[PDB]
Amino acid sequence: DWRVLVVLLPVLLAAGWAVRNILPYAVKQVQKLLQ
Amino acid sequence: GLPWYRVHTVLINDPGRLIAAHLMHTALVAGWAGSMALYELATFDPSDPVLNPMWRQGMFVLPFMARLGVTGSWSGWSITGETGIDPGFWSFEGVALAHIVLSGLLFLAACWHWVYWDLELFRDPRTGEPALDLPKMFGIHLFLAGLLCFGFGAFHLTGLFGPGMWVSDPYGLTGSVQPVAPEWGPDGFNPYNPGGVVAHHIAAGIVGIIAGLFHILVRPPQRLYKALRMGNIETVLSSSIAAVFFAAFVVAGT
Amino acid sequence: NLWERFCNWVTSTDNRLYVGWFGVIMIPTLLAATICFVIAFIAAPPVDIDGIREPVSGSLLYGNNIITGAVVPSSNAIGLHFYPIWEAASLDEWLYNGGPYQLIIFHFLLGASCYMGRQWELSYRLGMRPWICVAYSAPLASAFAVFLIYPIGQGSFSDGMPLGISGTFNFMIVFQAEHNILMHPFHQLGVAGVFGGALFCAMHGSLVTSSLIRETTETESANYGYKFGQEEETYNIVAAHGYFGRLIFQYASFNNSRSLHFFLAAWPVVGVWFTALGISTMAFNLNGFNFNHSVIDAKGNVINTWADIINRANLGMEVMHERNAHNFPLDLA
Amino acid sequence: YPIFTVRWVAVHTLAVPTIFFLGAIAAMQFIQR
Amino acid sequence: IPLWIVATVAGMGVIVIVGLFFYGAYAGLGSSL
Amino acid sequence: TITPSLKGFFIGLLSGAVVLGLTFAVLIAISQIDKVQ
Amino acid sequence: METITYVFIFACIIALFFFAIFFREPPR
Amino acid sequence: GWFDILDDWLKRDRFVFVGWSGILLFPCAYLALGGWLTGTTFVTSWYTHGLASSYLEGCNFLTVAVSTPANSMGHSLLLLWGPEAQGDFTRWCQLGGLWTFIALHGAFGLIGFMLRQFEIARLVGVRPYNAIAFSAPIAVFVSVFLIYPLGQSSWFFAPSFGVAAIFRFLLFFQGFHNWTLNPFHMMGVAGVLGGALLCAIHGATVENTLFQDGEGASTFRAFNPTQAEETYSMVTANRFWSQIFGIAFSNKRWLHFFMLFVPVTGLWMSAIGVVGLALNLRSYDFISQEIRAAEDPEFETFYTKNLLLNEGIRAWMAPQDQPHENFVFPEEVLPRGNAL
Amino acid sequence: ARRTWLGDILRPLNSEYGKVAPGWGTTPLMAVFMGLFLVFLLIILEIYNSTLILDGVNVSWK
Amino acid sequence: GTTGERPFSDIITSVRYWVIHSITIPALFIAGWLFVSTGLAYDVFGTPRPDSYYAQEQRSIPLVTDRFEAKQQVETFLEQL
Amino acid sequence: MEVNQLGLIATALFVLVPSVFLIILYVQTESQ
Amino acid sequence: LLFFFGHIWHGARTLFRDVFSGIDPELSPEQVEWGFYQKVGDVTTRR
Amino acid sequence: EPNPNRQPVELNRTSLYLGLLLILVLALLFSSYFFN
Amino acid sequence: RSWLATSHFVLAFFFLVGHLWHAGRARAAAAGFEKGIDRESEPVLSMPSLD
Numbered sequence A: 001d002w003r004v005l006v007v008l009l010p011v012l013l014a015a016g017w018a019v020r021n022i023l024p025y026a027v028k029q030v031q032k033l034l035q
Numbered sequence B: 001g002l003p004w005y006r007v008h009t010v011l012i013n014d015p016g017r018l019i020a021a022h023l024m025h026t027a028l029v030a031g032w033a034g035s036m037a038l039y040e041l042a043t044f045d046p047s048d049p050v051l052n053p054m055w056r057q058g059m060f061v062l063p064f065m066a067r068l069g070v071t072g073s074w075s076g077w078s079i080t081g082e083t084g085i086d087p088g089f090w091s092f093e094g095v096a097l098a099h100i101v102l103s104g105l106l107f108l109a110a111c112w113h114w115v116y117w118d119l120e121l122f123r124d125p126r127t128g129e130p131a132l133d134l135p136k137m138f139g140i141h142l143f144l145a146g147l148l149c150f151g152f153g154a155f156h157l158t159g160l161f162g163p164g165m166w167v168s169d170p171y172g173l174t175g176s177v178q179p180v181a182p183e184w185g186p187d188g189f190n191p192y193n194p195g196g197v198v199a200h201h202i203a204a205g206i207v208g209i210i211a212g213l214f215h216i217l218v219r220p221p222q223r224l225y226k227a228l229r230m231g232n233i234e235t236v237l238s239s240s241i242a243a244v245f246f247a248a249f250v251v252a253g254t
Numbered sequence C: 001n002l003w004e005r006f007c008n009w010v011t012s013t014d015n016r017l018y019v020g021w022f023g024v025i026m027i028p029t030l031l032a033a034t035i036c037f038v039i040a041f042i043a044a045p046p047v048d049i050d051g052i053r054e055p056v057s058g059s060l061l062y063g064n065n066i067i068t069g070a071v072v073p074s075s076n077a078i079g080l081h082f083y084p085i086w087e088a089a090s091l092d093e094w095l096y097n098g099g100p101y102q103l104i105i106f107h108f109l110l111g112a113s114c115y116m117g118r119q120w121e122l123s124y125r126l127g128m129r130p131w132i133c134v135a136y137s138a139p140l141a142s143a144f145a146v147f148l149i150y151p152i153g154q155g156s157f158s159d160g161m162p163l164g165i166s167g168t169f170n171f172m173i174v175f176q177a178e179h180n181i182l183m184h185p186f187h188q189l190g191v192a193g194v195f196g197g198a199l200f201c202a203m204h205g206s207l208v209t210s211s212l213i214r215e216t217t218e219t220e221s222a223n224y225g226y227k228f229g230q231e232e233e234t235y236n237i238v239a240a241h242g243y244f245g246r247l248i249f250q251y252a253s254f255n256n257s258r259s260l261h262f263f264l265a266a267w268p269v270v271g272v273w274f275t276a277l278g279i280s281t282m283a284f285n286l287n288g289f290n291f292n293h294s295v296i297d298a299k300g301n302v303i304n305t306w307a308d309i310i311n312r313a314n315l316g317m318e319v320m321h322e323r324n325a326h327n328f329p330l331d332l333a
Numbered sequence D: 001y002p003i004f005t006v007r008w009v010a011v012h013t014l015a016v017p018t019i020f021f022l023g024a025i026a027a028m029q030f031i032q033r
Numbered sequence E: 001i002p003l004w005i006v007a008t009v010a011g012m013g014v015i016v017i018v019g020l021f022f023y024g025a026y027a028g029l030g031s032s033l
Numbered sequence F: 001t002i003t004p005s006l007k008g009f010f011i012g013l014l015s016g017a018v019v020l021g022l023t024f025a026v027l028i029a030i031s032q033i034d035k036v037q
Numbered sequence G: 001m002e003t004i005t006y007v008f009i010f011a012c013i014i015a016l017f018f019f020a021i022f023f024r025e026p027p028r
Numbered sequence H: 001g002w003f004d005i006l007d008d009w010l011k012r013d014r015f016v017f018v019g020w021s022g023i024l025l026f027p028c029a030y031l032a033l034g035g036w037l038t039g040t041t042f043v044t045s046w047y048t049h050g051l052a053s054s055y056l057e058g059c060n061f062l063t064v065a066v067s068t069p070a071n072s073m074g075h076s077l078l079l080l081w082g083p084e085a086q087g088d089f090t091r092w093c094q095l096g097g098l099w100t101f102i103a104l105h106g107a108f109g110l111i112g113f114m115l116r117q118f119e120i121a122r123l124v125g126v127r128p129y130n131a132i133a134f135s136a137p138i139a140v141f142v143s144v145f146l147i148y149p150l151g152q153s154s155w156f157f158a159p160s161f162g163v164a165a166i167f168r169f170l171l172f173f174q175g176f177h178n179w180t181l182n183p184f185h186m187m188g189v190a191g192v193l194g195g196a197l198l199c200a201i202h203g204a205t206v207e208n209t210l211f212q213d214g215e216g217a218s219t220f221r222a223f224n225p226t227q228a229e230e231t232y233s234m235v236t237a238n239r240f241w242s243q244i245f246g247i248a249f250s251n252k253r254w255l256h257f258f259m260l261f262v263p264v265t266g267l268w269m270s271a272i273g274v275v276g277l278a279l280n281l282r283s284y285d286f287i288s289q290e291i292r293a294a295e296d297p298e299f300e301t302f303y304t305k306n307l308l309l310n311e312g313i314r315a316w317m318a319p320q321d322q323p324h325e326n327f328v329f330p331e332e333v334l335p336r337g338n339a340l
Numbered sequence I: 001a002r003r004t005w006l007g008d009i010l011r012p013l014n015s016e017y018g019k020v021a022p023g024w025g026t027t028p029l030m031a032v033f034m035g036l037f038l039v040f041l042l043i044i045l046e047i048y049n050s051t052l053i054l055d056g057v058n059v060s061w062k
Numbered sequence J: 001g002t003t004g005e006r007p008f009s010d011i012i013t014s015v016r017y018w019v020i021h022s023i024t025i026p027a028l029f030i031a032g033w034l035f036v037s038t039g040l041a042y043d044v045f046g047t048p049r050p051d052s053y054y055a056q057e058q059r060s061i062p063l064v065t066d067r068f069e070a071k072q073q074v075e076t077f078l079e080q081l
Numbered sequence K: 001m002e003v004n005q006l007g008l009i010a011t012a013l014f015v016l017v018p019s020v021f022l023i024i025l026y027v028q029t030e031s032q
Numbered sequence L: 001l002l003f004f005f006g007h008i009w010h011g012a013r014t015l016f017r018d019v020f021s022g023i024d025p026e027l028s029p030e031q032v033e034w035g036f037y038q039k040v041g042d043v044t045t046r047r
Numbered sequence M: 001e002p003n004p005n006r007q008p009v010e011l012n013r014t015s016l017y018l019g020l021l022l023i024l025v026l027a028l029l030f031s032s033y034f035f036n
Numbered sequence N: 001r002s003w004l005a006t007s008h009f010v011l012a013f014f015f016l017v018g019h020l021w022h023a024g025r026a027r028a029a030a031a032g033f034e035k036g037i038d039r040e041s042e043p044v045l046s047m048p049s050l051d
């Protein structure tokens, strides 16, 4: 119901926001790993 | 010198004296069984199974002889109340005297194995050192266990060649030793169905025989031999104790 | 000088037991309390602890075993009044009213207080650092709490902890009925102190035994690898820390032995200090948390919690402790 | 330094719900019967 | 960012949130009132 | 026949087998990528 | 007779204290 | 081989070691701890006990509990997919399913932790006495949370996971089993308190017999973990306790083993006696005392007083502590002295 | 050491000390049996526990 | 020695961290808030609301009496509200 | 006091048997 | 219950027997130093 | 031929004192229950 | 009265601990071993043995 999306919304936003601030620094980590 | 709590570690590389100490323990345990039953017979009052049964009198071994068929005394009474019945040799008294004689025989055996600890059988033929091949020993003994287990369900409890086992109505009113037919359906895992007990020993005895044969023929995987230290007898004590406490809990629960 | 010889022997380091000036009080007072305790445990007659002329038997010869036996506390009629032998018309009256209790506890508290001082003293004579006596202050304070402080606040040595195994339990139970000490954070810190101390004691012992350096064969005790007064450490602190730091994470482990041993001292001592203080402040009827009927529904029905179940049990102790002593409906003594 | 590790997972399975739970417990103080 | 600032603000966040829990103990659910 | 509880028993059996499977699947994969020298 | 046993055990413990302190094994 | 590859990764030196034992330990521990946290915050006890028990209902940190299932569930494993909940998460919570969830995942977590101590000890090079000593916590947990309720009519009479709930458990055991009178609990007291004592006294002794290895007045700096010499003086600590107490340790190895022995031994003794209380095989009475007291109304000991208190506990708490019994005690049957 | 008649007869049964099958051997098979036994023990237990209720299986004295 | 992860000191000090976490920590916190303020926590877990412990004229506690139809017994309780 | 008629023998043996055990072991140590 | 301890005890005595008279006197500090080996205790895994 | 697996046993004075104390204290604790 | 009685017993008890703390340290600082025992002149190692 509507309450679930009300609750998950910040977390989704936070996760996406963190994903966007960390993304260049993560894909280099994985690239470094593939050796 | 050795501390007090380590005196018995001198049997660790002495299979003969380890067998001797195991025989002495077996003598003492069977000695206890005969003692306990003699003591209970000397005190148990048989004149009324309704209001003064054995379990009101602190009887501890007596119900185990009855569980498996022993029900009567050389002096004429039966724990069910029926008079003029003949138990033959396997009375409560006969069971006790057998255990006393067994204890004595084991006692003499331990003396022999203790004095003759240094048997060529215990030595490793190519190195000269005391050695026990515990994986093959386990196959032999497991094969022996399945046989006796199978034999106990198929002959003793079926009645095919033995007395049966105690069984009774749901209110414990009219119980008696009776031959019992194996229950091979799923209701044989019902704890309150005697037929499951017959089926279990036949099936597990068979499984025990197969597995014993397997453990006699196939050597253990090298990786499992190193991980479990299969050349060290103490690993057997360890898994054995573990299996014994698993059993202790189950019988306490049931 | 003759007084200087006496003082030289009182303070000697060559005595099998150290005497010292604290010991000049300790030895006689403890000996007095010990002799009177032994005699009263075996032989005392019944004592009228609740001052209602219903005497309570506590000695072996009067039908007690090691578990039920006690030196019974002195009468409630006495209260906080001092009651030595000479204040009584006869030994018979003294025994009936609880005399040996005061004699014993006052001599003992004096004797144990000087035991603490004796610990500072010999430590000073030996060139030691001095704080072992500070650790012993935590059980001493606890003894002070239940023999002296709690009687002061309640108003009678008759509420002191009986000198006996069952008497002790009668003290704990009545205490919980009256003060709810399970719900008091100072007893909770005491639990955290003795449980934690047990845990850490267990931990330190297993970790050091674990790191013992091989010096013996298998046919002998590992203990014979240590000789009294070797300069080399007998275990490997680095290996022990290597182990325990991996058990949790490395920064949750101790790599400094002095820092670890200080922690071993501080955790139980502080927690016992607080639990002494909990008895000492419940003596003045500042009680444990009271949550009775704390949760209510929208209509106003009480919605019990576990606190309200604790209360039903507290109530049942309450209305049965000192079952004849109350003539009025509030338990104010 | 790597950014995501076994530690990373460990701190976030404890910490994410902790802050979430503190939030839920926060709002509970304003519930009136 | 100096850690001593991070230490003080976190604790300050801790103290605030604890204070809110003790506060609720006198009001609303569980207040006896 | 298959009673409701026996149906539940398989529900639990497969759930646990899925959980241990995903677990060991992911653990073997991580171990193949980030090996030791 | 129970009293005698309780007091006897206590007394053996005191005697043990005495021997454990004054006739201990001397640490060298 | 893939097994040796997975062994390589599980045994990697990280911040938080994993190991083979981690596959059992972490999910079970995390789920036990998460289940307790979940229930004390959100989950009631209104249908199992008639109790409130969550932050959401009004309880504080001392009164929240994951409470035991109602007596009527017997010893049901109370699995989510089992027959009582039938896969309904809401109803499972309302029926007490978090209790078994926590107790069972907790039990297996403790197995994982003890295996962890084994696993790390073998990799690091030390003897495994730390895992041996952890037997006592496991023995305690098994006897109190599994065996004891298995002995009784249901999981209901196990301890509920909560601070005040644990206190009630303590009080139930005094009023019903007279647990203080049991010598197996007495041996536990003596091992817990005697452990606290050994912890306090050994820490103080070392800190107050240190050698002077620095010039600072805070003496901690004067230790380097790689050093070879003892940091305190066993000779001096021995003379002190010899002259203060009568006896003193002289062997550092025996001293540290003794610190293992005492509290481990004592917890094991208290488990044994709890196993007895599973069967109501209590140390409740002394028959000699009851025979005297029944024939002599002037005989009164602290033992007979405690029994009056136990009887008061039982009658005053049972109607609400055992609500499945539908107990109704009219006022006049309640035991009580004068006035109160 | 001491040769006896029964010794010489028993001799071969104690003569493969330390002999192992190479590598992992029959371990995978042991696992499949270990797994079946576990599923089996779990059925026994849930039938006694009355978590698993089967037709014709009435777990009771009756 | 040091195992290999980035020190926690450098992390809660670094600017990138608090860029990320000044949003995430409040988000979860607000998420938790909404879980209770929407009343979702009540229905997920089945915990009664202050008006759902009894019916308007009842002091009897809805105790589960039967083991196997228990799921239905709880729901027969909720209906009487 | 109406006590167990076997408590005396029980307590006496419970002390005596392990005590004599230890004494036996100690004295044969001191003779080596 | 009591035998489970015996299992733990004798289990440990079996798996750890090479050090039950005490850990190695020559054991290198690098073995217990974090990060020094990529696999704990394996000496074939230095950085 | 003598068995080579024999070993002398030892209990030192301290262990004797600790053990006598363990037994005496256990007796002192349990005798009450024995007498019941 | 409760509030004042309980607080000042706590303060009093801790100040007695404070007295024991600083007293013993004062005595050891003045004598010169408040930092621990000199290895090269350990006092007990020069006293005779108790037995």
Ligand code: CLA
Pocket: B026, B027, B029, B030, B032, B033, B034, B036, B037, B061, B062, B064, B065, B067, B068, B070, B095, B099, B102, B142, B145, B146, B149, B204, B205, B207, B208, B209, B247
């Ligand atoms: C010669 C054989 C023999 C026989 C026929 C009997 C017969 C009897 N004994 Mg005696 N006894 C014997 C030898 C024998 N005993 C010996 C050698 C000893 C010394 C150890 C004893 C010690 C002893 C005691 C202590 C007691 C008896 C008692 C009894 C009676 C009850 C037995 C019972 O319930 O057992 C039940 C037995 C079991 C449940 C065995 C279970 C075994 C476990 C499950 C083994 C698991 C491992 C196995 C290898 C599994 C793997 C294989 C599998 C896959 C197939 C019965 C009259 C009782 C009595 O009433 O005495 C008066 C009693 O208390 N006996």
Ligand code: CLA
Pocket: F010, F012, F013, F014, F015, F016, F017, F019, H023, H024, H025, H027, H028, H031, H077, H078, H079, H080, H081, H097, H100, H101, H102, H104, H105, H108, I035, I039, I042
């Ligand atoms: C180490 C991991 C671990 C362990 C030991 C446990 C253990 C347990 N969990 Mg937990 N759990 C875990 C992880 C774990 N859990 C995880 C990661 C989660 C989150 C997803 C959960 C979520 C969870 C829930 C929601 C519940 C449990 C519960 C349980 C209990 C019941 C388990 C059961 O019946 O399994 C049965 C299944 C197996 C043993 C699988 C056997 C697999 C082997 C290899 C055989 C394979 C057979 C094959 C598939 C053929 C099938 C049959 C076919 C021929 C017909 C038990 C105490 C229950 C509980 O506590 O209830 C009170 C419960 O409700 N767990």
Ligand code: CLA
Pocket: C172, C194, C195, H033, H136, H137, H138, H139, H140, H141, H143, H144, H169, H170, H171, H173, H174, H178, H179, H180, H185, H188, H189, H192, H193, H266, H267, H270, H271, H272, H274
């Ligand atoms: C002087 C007072 C005193 C003392 C010292 C003790 C001492 C003891 N009592 Mg007793 N008791 C007392 C008074 C006392 N009691 C009184 C007056 C009563 C009333 C009659 C009781 C009633 C009572 C009961 C009812 C019980 C005890 C038990 C115990 C034992 C508990 C040991 C323990 O650590 O359990 C603690 C539990 C464990 C160690 C289990 C393992 C726990 C794991 C390791 C925890 C891990 C947590 C994990 C990391 C996450 C936590 C996170 C979370 C905090 C957020 C111990 C011997 C218990 C017992 O005998 O058990 C056998 C028991 O059940 N006592």
Ligand code: CLA
Pocket: B004, B005, B006, B007, B008, B009, B237, B241, L002, L003, L004, L005, L006, L007, L009, L010, L013
């Ligand atoms: C079948 C089970 C079994 C067997 C064969 C062994 C065998 C052994 N154990 Mg193990 N052990 C077991 C069970 C077993 N243990 C269990 C269940 C426990 C927990 C209680 C332990 C705890 C344990 C420890 C902690 C140690 C051993 C050690 C040993 C070894 C030396 C023992 C010795 O010399 O004792 C000599 C014993 C005495 C001189 C007197 C003991 C008297 C006891 C304390 C009370 C009296 C009991 C009574 C006479 C009979 C009870 C019968 C019945 C209840 C079983 C030996 C290989 C030792 C070891 O590893 O050495 C290297 C060691 O330190 N065991």
Ligand SMILES: CC(C)=CCC/C(C)=C/CC/C(C)=C/CC/C(C)=C/CC/C(C)=C/CC/C(C)=C/CC/C(C)=C/CC/C(C)=C/CC/C(C)=C/CC1=CC(=O)C(C)=C(C)C1=O
Pocket: C200, C201, C203, C204, C205, C207, C208, C237, C240, C241, C244, C245, C248, C252, C253, C254, C255, C260, D006, D009, D010, D013, D014, F019, F023, H016, H018, H022, H023, H026, H027, H029, H030, H033
């Ligand atoms: C099924 C699936 C998914 C499987 C996958 C599993 C997988 C790979 C997971 C990876 C990700 C992962 C790890 C997730 C984990 C999630 C997680 C955090 C789970 C943990 C849950 C949980 C309950 C953790 C509890 C942690 C815990 C026990 C913390 C303890 C805190 C605590 C009490 C610390 C006290 C320690 C302390 C004060 C010690 C000093 C006291 C003392 C006396 C020490 C003695 C001492 C110390 C020395 O120092 C040395 C020297 C010596 C001599 C000595 O005496």
Ligand SMILES: CCCCCCCCCCCCCCCC(=O)OC[C@H](COP(=O)(O)OC[C@@H](O)CO)OC(=O)CCCCCCCCCCCCCCC
Pocket: C131, C132, C134, C135, C189, C262, C265, C266, C269, C270, H204, H207, H208, H217, H218, H219, H220, N025, N034, N035
């Ligand atoms: C400064 C605060 C003091 C708090 C009370 C004292 C705590 C330690 C007392 C233990 C005595 C143990 C017996 C001898 C123990 C012993 O011998 O100690 C020895 C140990 C080392 O002594 P040093 O000689 O190096 O230092 C002491 C002085 O010489 C200063 O150099 O002493 C300390 O480290 C004291 C640390 C002071 C800082 C203590 C703070 C800890 C408490 C924090 C608050 C906790 C509150 C909990 C609330 C629930």
Ligand SMILES: CCCCCCCCCCCCCCCC(=O)OC[C@H](COP(=O)(O)OC[C@@H](O)CO)OC(=O)CCCCCCCCCCCCCCC
Pocket: C017, C223, G010, G013, G016, G017, G020, G021, H244, H245, H246, H247, H248, H249, H250, H251, H252, H254, H255, H258, M012, M014, M015, M017, M018, M021, M025
């Ligand atoms: C001011 C004078 C005060 C005197 C107080 C009384 C002192 C008595 C102390 C006990 C002496 C007996 C010790 C025997 C045992 C003995 O001689 O120990 C000697 C032993 C010496 O240890 P070592 O390290 O030298 O042992 C090394 C090797 O021999 C080990 O194999 O001491 C300990 O092990 C400490 C742990 C025992 C702790 C015992 C605590 C005693 C508390 C009393 C409990 C009984 C209560 C009875 C109530 C009725």
Ligand SMILES: CC1=C(/C=C/C(C)=C/C=C/C(C)=C/C=C/C=C(C)/C=C/C=C(C)/C=C/C2=C(C)CCCC2(C)C)C(C)(C)CCC1
Pocket: B027, B028, B029, B030, B031, B032, B035, B100, B101, B103, B104, B105, B107, B108
């Ligand atoms: C104290 C106690 C206990 C223990 C007990 C026991 C351990 C016992 C033992 C017992 C026993 C261990 C018994 C035994 C017995 C034996 C016997 C009784 C034997 C007999 C034999 C005989 C008589 C033989 C003879 C002979 C010979 C030698 C030659 C050949 C032939 C003939 C037969 C002639 C318990 C834990 C319960 C706890 C409680 C108390």
Ligand SMILES: CC1=C(/C=C/C(C)=C/C=C/C(C)=C/C=C/C=C(C)/C=C/C=C(C)/C=C/C2=C(C)CCCC2(C)C)C(C)(C)CCC1
Pocket: D013, D014, D017, D018, D021, D022, E014, E018, H030, H031, H033, H034, H035, H037, H038, H101
């Ligand atoms: C149940 C379940 C589950 C699980 C879940 C989980 C896993 C959860 C988790 C959760 C969590 C994980 C939570 C957390 C929480 C936390 C909290 C809630 C905290 C709080 C804290 C505080 C409040 C603090 C306090 C303090 C301290 C303690 C210290 C100092 C002082 C102070 C006061 C600050 C699942 C679904 C899977 C399945 C089904 C069942």
Ligand SMILES: [Cl-]
Pocket: C170, C174, C320, C321, C322, C323, H305
């Ligand atoms: Cl009273």
Ligand SMILES: [Cl-]
Pocket: C325, C326, C327, C328
């Ligand atoms: Cl009054």
Ligand SMILES: [Fe+3]
Pocket: C204, C208, H202, H206
């Ligand atoms: Fe130490």
